[PDB]
Design a protein around this motif. Structure first.
Motif, short mmCIF file in Angstrom:
data_model
loop_
_atom_site.label_atom_id
_atom_site.label_comp_id
_atom_site.label_asym_id
_atom_site.label_seq_id
_atom_site.Cartn_x
_atom_site.Cartn_y
_atom_site.Cartn_z
N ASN A 6 24.99 37.90 33.70
CA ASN A 6 25.84 39.09 33.66
C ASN A 6 26.28 39.40 32.21
N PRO A 7 25.43 40.11 31.46
CA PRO A 7 25.66 40.33 30.03
C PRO A 7 26.96 41.06 29.63
N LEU A 8 27.29 42.20 30.25
CA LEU A 8 28.49 42.96 29.86
C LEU A 8 29.82 42.23 30.15
N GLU A 9 29.89 41.47 31.24
CA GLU A 9 31.16 40.89 31.68
C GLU A 9 31.27 39.35 31.68
N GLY A 10 30.17 38.65 31.96
CA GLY A 10 30.14 37.20 31.98
C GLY A 10 31.08 36.58 33.01
N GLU A 11 31.77 35.51 32.61
CA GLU A 11 32.69 34.79 33.50
C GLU A 11 34.06 35.48 33.68
N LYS A 12 34.22 36.65 33.06
CA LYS A 12 35.34 37.55 33.33
C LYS A 12 35.18 38.13 34.75
N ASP A 13 33.94 38.46 35.10
CA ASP A 13 33.61 38.95 36.44
C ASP A 13 33.78 37.89 37.54
N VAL A 14 33.69 36.61 37.17
CA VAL A 14 34.00 35.55 38.13
C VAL A 14 35.49 35.61 38.46
N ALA A 15 36.33 35.71 37.42
CA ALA A 15 37.78 35.81 37.58
C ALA A 15 38.14 36.99 38.48
N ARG A 16 37.49 38.13 38.22
CA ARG A 16 37.71 39.35 38.98
C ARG A 16 37.37 39.16 40.45
N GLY A 17 36.13 38.74 40.73
CA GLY A 17 35.69 38.44 42.09
C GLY A 17 36.57 37.43 42.81
N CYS A 18 37.12 36.47 42.07
CA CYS A 18 37.94 35.41 42.65
C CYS A 18 39.33 35.86 43.09
N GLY A 19 39.70 37.08 42.71
CA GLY A 19 41.03 37.59 43.02
C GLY A 19 41.14 39.07 43.33
N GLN A 20 40.02 39.79 43.33
CA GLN A 20 40.08 41.24 43.52
C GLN A 20 40.21 41.67 44.99
N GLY A 21 40.17 40.70 45.90
CA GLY A 21 40.15 40.99 47.32
C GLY A 21 41.10 40.11 48.10
N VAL A 22 41.08 40.26 49.42
CA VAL A 22 41.98 39.54 50.31
C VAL A 22 42.08 38.05 49.96
N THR A 23 40.92 37.41 49.81
CA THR A 23 40.89 35.96 49.61
C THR A 23 40.83 35.57 48.13
N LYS A 24 41.75 34.70 47.75
CA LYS A 24 41.88 34.27 46.36
C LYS A 24 41.46 32.81 46.20
N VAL A 25 40.43 32.62 45.37
CA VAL A 25 39.75 31.34 45.22
C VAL A 25 39.91 30.78 43.81
N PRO A 26 40.26 29.50 43.69
CA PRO A 26 40.40 28.87 42.38
C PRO A 26 39.11 28.91 41.55
N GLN A 27 39.28 29.08 40.24
CA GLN A 27 38.18 29.09 39.29
C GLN A 27 38.32 27.96 38.27
N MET A 28 37.27 27.15 38.14
CA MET A 28 37.17 26.16 37.06
C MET A 28 36.49 26.83 35.87
N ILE A 29 37.18 26.86 34.73
CA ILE A 29 36.61 27.47 33.52
C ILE A 29 35.84 26.43 32.72
N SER A 30 34.60 26.79 32.37
CA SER A 30 33.70 25.90 31.65
C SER A 30 33.97 25.90 30.15
N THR A 31 33.96 24.71 29.56
CA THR A 31 33.88 24.55 28.10
C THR A 31 32.70 25.36 27.57
N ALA A 32 31.61 25.39 28.35
CA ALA A 32 30.36 26.04 27.96
C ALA A 32 30.29 27.52 28.35
N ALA A 33 31.46 28.13 28.57
CA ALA A 33 31.55 29.54 28.97
C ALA A 33 31.23 30.49 27.81
N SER A 34 30.50 31.57 28.12
CA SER A 34 30.19 32.61 27.15
C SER A 34 31.45 33.29 26.62
#
Ligand SMILES: Cc1cc2nc3c(=O)[nH]c(=O)nc-3n(C[C@H](O)[C@H](O)[C@H](O)COP(=O)(O)O)c2cc1C
Ligand SMILES: Cc1cc2nc3c(=O)[nH]c(=O)nc-3n(C[C@H](O)[C@H](O)[C@H](O)COP(=O)(O)O)c2cc1C
Ligand SMILES: Cc1cc2nc3c(=O)[nH]c(=O)nc-3n(C[C@H](O)[C@H](O)[C@H](O)COP(=O)(O)O)c2cc1C
Ligand SMILES: Cc1cc2nc3c(=O)[nH]c(=O)nc-3n(C[C@H](O)[C@H](O)[C@H](O)COP(=O)(O)O)c2cc1C
Lengths: 395, 389, 395, 389
Positions: D105-133
């Motif tokens: 996901n070139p434009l958004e990267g792991e920002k879009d993971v954060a979004r998906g993890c909280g943009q809806g009814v169900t909110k899911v924990p996110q582990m952020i990678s040292t190796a994140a873009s």
């Protein structure tokens, strides 16, 4: 059965062969060799006895063993050197005896394996075969290091004078051990080879060259006639490991000749797992060195055998394929591929030396899960249609 | 289906068949037979019952057994001769009964089996089938050697007069034993044969009892083997009523599907016979799925007095007649000698259980179904490729 | 998602369908149906839940059981009749409840299964489904015999009045038992079906039609409101078989709904093997009738379940496929195929009645060998070349 | 490689991707990702170590476990919420750390993971990678909800100054815990990546000891989970030095091949924690090979406090960005609820070992090699055919 098509392979050899630096693992050498070797060179190297189940089972049995790796250990420095048969060795593996290297390396044959084994920063012991294309003198003088160790693989002849001369000749030339091969009194039937001659009894698989009458008494006698440490190569049961200790020989190779002799001989890795505890149950562990070979292709395989108590692990075919494709540098590359794989996996295992590799690093609970499925239900499976992935629209 | 197409077949069996001396193992015979025989010859020979699991399991079960070979034993000389049913034999195997050889070998049939079984150095016992294309007399005399031994397989008729005649008549002709088939009271459903065509027989009496075998013991001096035992309890029963032997057999997987591999029944019953002193009283034979010298050896190591082969001889006969049969005998004889040497023993009497790894004999498994989706999407590792071109 | 291609199938239906007399086994009906049914009819009938492992495991677990056949027994006459739920039955199997038969048999649907079940010399019990295209009254009056038995499969509605009416209605019409389905409080996700709609949440798999709140107390209450013997359909553990006995219901079907509900529910054949001994360990065996279903395709399967103590064994899909290809005569043929297979194998087993089928006719030693192989070594297997058969000359 | 061919790719990811709402399971995401991603994006995500056996075994081992479901239980209402690391959570699963999302996901990267993890009814924990873009701060704020929880995964540096900075810096940004990766002192050899291109890092300190974790306990108030434990003995060790949790993990089969499936380590260690009163002291997480609600349930029944997924979220993100991630969360949430109901329980706390059949957990088998010749010549049964035409 070569076709001028011989030239289709010359084209492939023609550095259509990828750069040596692009070889990732031992399987790469195998694939390349399979496309470039003579039909007969490929038949002879790659074949096993009858249905070839022992040949394949040698390798697969490693996969019945998993790891129990230690975490949060200081694994900055890792040392993979050890001792074999009184010599200090850079590496816990060795090149096993293999015949007819000139089939795959016409110009240099076994001399290129001596070179590959001893040229680089990492030297590997080499077991010289009686069925070598080159002579022991040629192979020994090709050795580029005074430090590199060379062993000798022996078939005792029906004419024991020839063997007496041979043993004397090879101690003179400075080999450091004798491996007496005891698993080939009769020649294993390798059907890929035969298919090729036929279109392209019983006492005929006997030969004066390999004495079928060889006996425990003969090894006891050989022991008196030489100061070289003797290893019995081709032991396939614990009872014979114990007999070997009893006659006070130096070691044993748990081996079935790469699946080229008896089919349904067991994987030496499981013979090892059964043998070592029984050795410690009678003080015999540190008095007989136990080597293992057959089906070793990855560093994790080497590691598994070492954790079970093998002194060293031998590889045959993988060095033949490396030599057949890239000669002396192929051998050295194979050595580096394997050294690195062993180093990597030791770190991840959480140990730092060969002495630290012990049984409790292994999960041995499924070591015996050697299974044969009930034949499957062809009608049931034929009509059955599996789930499917969503398709893409196609516009 | 049989479509005038079958000159494509006649071309195959033409000089197109490879020289007999190029045949390496018993599967080669099977392959060649599969391309040349008539659809109906093939269906009838190659067939098993229903899903054919027992058929295949008969063979695969040998692969649950591994060897613990002795090394450093003088194996220059090896003897594979043995006794079977009171008479001395060259090999520890035999040809099992196997109907309608004329479908595959039209001019000669099971006469060519007799020939192959005795025309050369090694002489192998032949079981003659009730279901044979040729008559028992036609076969017994086509045998080129009087040293060679012949057995008779018998289905007892519902009309017991016919059986009494047939017994007396085979005793006369010189058969050295009588094999009574008990695993086919009703003939098994062989679906390959049936699909091409588009269960109680008078030939075979479904009422056959132990008492009837007790009866046959008195009415004949030929030794009786009960052919088709599939549990230990009935092996014991055969000993108690005092017959000579027993074939652990399920009719080559042609009768009851999910009958166990005889090799596995063998491994269960011999230790029990021992715990009862019965191991000498009863000779225990075994057939089904035997294709390699090591199969035979596994069986002998377990206690089998001898091991039978059906289909391999049918296929060798179908392709090369009596010569094929002789060659099949040779292949199998050599396979046994060579593997004997590597095993580290020199006589049949020395084949014992301690030569075997029996620790995984019970690893008869059925995998959980595979994960179709997970496997489809997964991409395996790949080999390094070869440059450009 | 039908294509006019609809007509490619009409051609196949066009007695390109082979004569009924040419059908050998139940798999034949399956294959034929797979080529002739509507994409949706085939999706709905043949699909299981999620990855469909329970669906397939239902069948395969039969193959972990082998036979120990008796020899030299008088097996001239064999009798395969028995009793189920107070009725005398020609056969130890039955047609299990299945929805929507008009998808495969548009003209007659479930009425053709009533016909096939009761027309011939051999009658089979029929379980009428709540999800039937035809009405219970239509299906019951289509029954060609007064002797043929028809059972009723019930989903208890969230609105218990509807269920009260339904139970009263079906005892009036003369069904002989109630099978209450307890394994579908939520609808199993059958992905072949969904693939087809999508291109061609969570509480959405709940429905007022099947009450998710159904409880042991409700069955106890149902028991008072009807004189019909009640069977709990969809029991997947021994603990619930015991609870069923405790509330004094008539029987239990060990069933996972043909792998259409919970994936990784066990094969009912192994639940059976564990349950029956535990029933005899507390006198409960002859007080609860235990049926089994899922993956039954051969008479040897039926036989295996009977030897373990099942009162009867149900088949779903095989009767649907027979009905979908050949209507009422297909059903009857399926019945004859299976009857014959049971008869054949009883002779060969060495028994002559259903009461004689007992545990010691089975080899149960590998019943637990439900295995998952370690993934295989794709590189090793890829480069490996197997033995080969001799070729033919080719002139 | 990457050959201007890759407009064939751009055509695939074009409106050619099926509507998000047609996606049924997590494998669909994987399939689509496999056709559209760059060779190098694919190699890097899909890769495992050496022969990739651990990678696959992580998943297949779940299939050694079967269910013993309860019936006749009121399952109208079901709750799948639970606690993880002191904070309350909507689901019993989480997104595991997983480098370089910008390849897929070139434009958004792991920002879009954060979004998906909280943009809806169900909110899911996110582990952020040292190796994140993206940087940790860039991600933590792209999160559309302040209810949603974020964890940090840490490789401790050889230069311990950098680690001390990074810890203090993530504490600041609001991460509710610290995951210390210990299974990668040397980076595993991923051969698919290497073949396309044609082992000690400063990033990762190979000298990391228990004592160093004891050190990090004092220097931070964030709870520490040791991520990458592969034996029971070290789970015990983590309890003794008193950390909060432990991920039973082998880095998605990306490190040591022939490391055991975490599910199998789970089944071994929980009973041991019990025999020691340690089951409360330590929270035990599990990742690897999780693709179905029933995988998650198996893990929870065994004692896992929560279960992680790496690749499935990467693939959903690579194909549909934040929406894909939300949809993946939905698929998995529904799979758990539906299977909970069929299992016959209504809360996470009610998922216990008695719901499981563990009798074949150890049936990790390797078949004897197949009989190539016997299988080639053998001809299986065949289905009845359809007439003429
Ligand atoms: C081509 C070939 C020739 C061999 N020749 C000999 C030999 O002359 N003497 C001997 O003792 N072993 C011989 N071996 C066997 C090995 O030394 C060794 O047991 C085997 O290669 C180990 O198995 P692997 O090739 O799977 O690693 C030979 C093996 C091969 C493949
Ligand atoms: C074509 C064919 C016909 C057979 N006919 C008989 C028979 O009439 N009587 C009998 O007792 N066995 C009969 N058998 C079975 C065998 O004698 C033997 O038990 C079986 O072939 C052993 O299995 P195998 O073919 O795998 O070696 C027959 C087998 C075949 C293949
Ligand atoms: C198409 C289809 C629909 C079904 N509908 C129902 C139903 O409404 N009620 C029920 O209790 N079982 C239903 N079942 C399940 C069965 O009654 C039975 O458990 C299953 O078909 C047994 O498995 P088999 O098809 O492999 O023989 C259905 C099964 C199928 C295949
Ligand atoms: C592309 C990729 C990159 C990863 N990077 C890291 C990392 O930097 N640190 C870490 O601790 N785990 C890392 N992981 C592994 C996971 O956090 C997780 O343990 C793994 O993905 C679990 O397996 P699964 O992908 O089968 O769900 C990575 C995994 C993948 C697939």
């Amino acid at each position: 059965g070569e076709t001028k098509e011989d030239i289709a392979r010359k084209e492939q050899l023609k550095s259509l062969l990828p750069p040596l630096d692009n070889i990732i693992n031992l399987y790469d050498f195998e694939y390349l060799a399979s496309q470039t070797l003579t039909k007969q060179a490929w038949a002879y190297y790659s074949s096993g006895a009858n249905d070839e189940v022992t040949h394949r089972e040698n390798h697969n049995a490693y996969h019945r063993i998993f790891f129990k790796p230690k975490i949060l250990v200081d694994v900055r420095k890792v040392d993979i050197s050890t001792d074999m048969l009184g010599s200090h060795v850079d590496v816990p593996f060795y090149v096993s005896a293999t015949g007819l290297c000139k089939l795959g390396n016409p110009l240099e044959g076994e001399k290129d394996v001596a070179r590959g084994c001893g040229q680089g920063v990492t030297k590997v012991p080499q077991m010289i075969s009686t069925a070598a294309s080159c002579s022991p003198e040629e192979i020994i003088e090709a050795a580029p290091s005074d430090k590199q160790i060379q062993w000798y693989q022996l078939y005792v002849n029906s004419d024991r004078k020839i063997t007496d001369d041979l043993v004397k000749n090879v101690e003179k030339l400075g080999v450091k051990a004798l491996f007496v091969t005891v698993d080939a009194p009769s020649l294993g039937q390798r059907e890929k080879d035969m298919k090729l001659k036929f279109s392209n009894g019983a006492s005929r698989a006997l030969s004066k060259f390999i004495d079928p009458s060889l006996t425990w008494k003969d090894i006891e006698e050989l022991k008196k006639k030489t100061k070289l440490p003797i290893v019995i190569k081709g032991v396939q049961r614990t009872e014979d490991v114990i007999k070997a200790a009893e006659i006070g020989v130096s070691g044993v190779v748990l081996s079935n000749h790469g699946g080229r002799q008896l089919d349904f001989s067991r994987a030496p890795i499981e013979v090892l797992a059964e043998t070592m505890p029984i050795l410690e149950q009678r003080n015999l562990k540190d008095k007989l060195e136990v080597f293992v070979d057959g089906g070793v292709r990855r560093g994790t395989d080497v590691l598994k055998a070492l954790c079970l108590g093998a002194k060293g692990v031998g590889l045959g075919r993988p060095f033949l394929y490396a030599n057949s494709c890239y000669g002396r540098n192929g051998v050295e590359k194979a050595i580096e591929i394997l050294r690195d794989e062993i180093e990597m996996s030791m770190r991840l295992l959480g140990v730092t030396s060969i002495a630290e590799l012990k049984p409790d690093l292994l999960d041995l609970s499924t070591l015996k899960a050697r299974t044969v499925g009930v034949p499957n239900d062809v009608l049931y499976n034929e009509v059955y249609e599996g789930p499917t992935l969503t398709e893409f629209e196609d516009a």
